[model samples]
Target: AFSVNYDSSFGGYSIHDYLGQWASTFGDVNHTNGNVTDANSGGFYGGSLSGSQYAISSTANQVTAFVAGGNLTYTLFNEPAHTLYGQLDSLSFGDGLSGGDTSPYSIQVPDVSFGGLNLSSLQAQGHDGVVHQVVYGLMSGDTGALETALNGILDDYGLSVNSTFDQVAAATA
Candidate 1:
């Protein structure tokens, strides 16, 4: 369980920065709930719990690998202006309860960037019975981290960054 601190001084903060910090600190937690009603057992039964942990970081960029317990986990990344996007970097499953059958696995998140912003947002969705729903979460950090990293990278290209956030309400005409 990792806590996040955001600096509301600079336009509040970018979604990219927030998600970065989140993925870096707490890794990722995914939960699922479902029920089975078949001839085998008339009762309800289905659920899973899983999470991820950080592996490495370089130049303000980090990577986290995750795992699922019983069911599969789906993740997505969305952002305004279609600038940054996130994808499943990779995935692995554990052995089955029977010990003889193999589990399923998959992972994606290729190095894709849009509008000069790298991948940032992330969404996790699960399936239950004949219905499905998705939950979204950020993997970026605060403005401080965003500024530092962006400045470092952009500076090399002779580019600078600046932003401001005013929390005051608009004056009436």
Candidate 2:
């Protein structure tokens, strides 16, 4: 379990920085020097998780990554400039601060900014079954550990979290 601290980079943290910190802390948890960087052609990305290898890559248009073997892919925005899941405003784990914001949740728009988990965003995405898992993971003492653990089971047996959640709202509707 690790604690994140936010100093100056809070609401305005860029996706590149966010992904870098995420990689660093994730690497620390699993005992590796995990790092992330922006690609000249692409957006930003990194790879290395547990004994197996996983990649987390993000572009201005979208993010594609594997979490605990689950192929998690989500759209970054809506047409005509409507924002979607991309902003990451939540916790600051790599900085080595004692605690993060009151809410360890992240919202996606221009970047993955940390703040309270935006319920409206989830609702907009039509995610029902996935929300609980996210809530549980965020609320846990360790955002990284719990979220990774939860994500591992999210697509157990080769299921896609996005694949199913994409239809979750439809199923409820």
Which candidate leads the pack in TM-score? 2
Model 2 residue runs over 4 Å out of place are 1-6, 9-13, 28-92, 95-113, 120-128, 131-173
Error of 1 at 38 (Å): 25
How many residue pairs collide in each prediction?
14, 19
Give the best candidate by lDDT.
Answer: 2
Error of 2 at 100 (Å): 13
Query: How high is each candidate's TM-score?
Result: 0.19, 0.22
What RMSD, rounded to one decimal, does every model reach? 17.5, 18.0
Name model 1 segments beyond 4 Å from true: 1-12, 30-173
Candidate 1 lDDT over residue span 1-173, tens digit each: 11122233323434344334434653333221242123211111121211221111212222332221222222212312112123222212111112112322222331211122221333222221111111122222123443444455444444433321121111100
lDDT of 2 by residue, 1-173 (tens): 11122344433443333554454333322211243234311111221111111222223213322122122223323331211223222332322111112321222222222233222234255333343234223322224433443235433334322323223223222
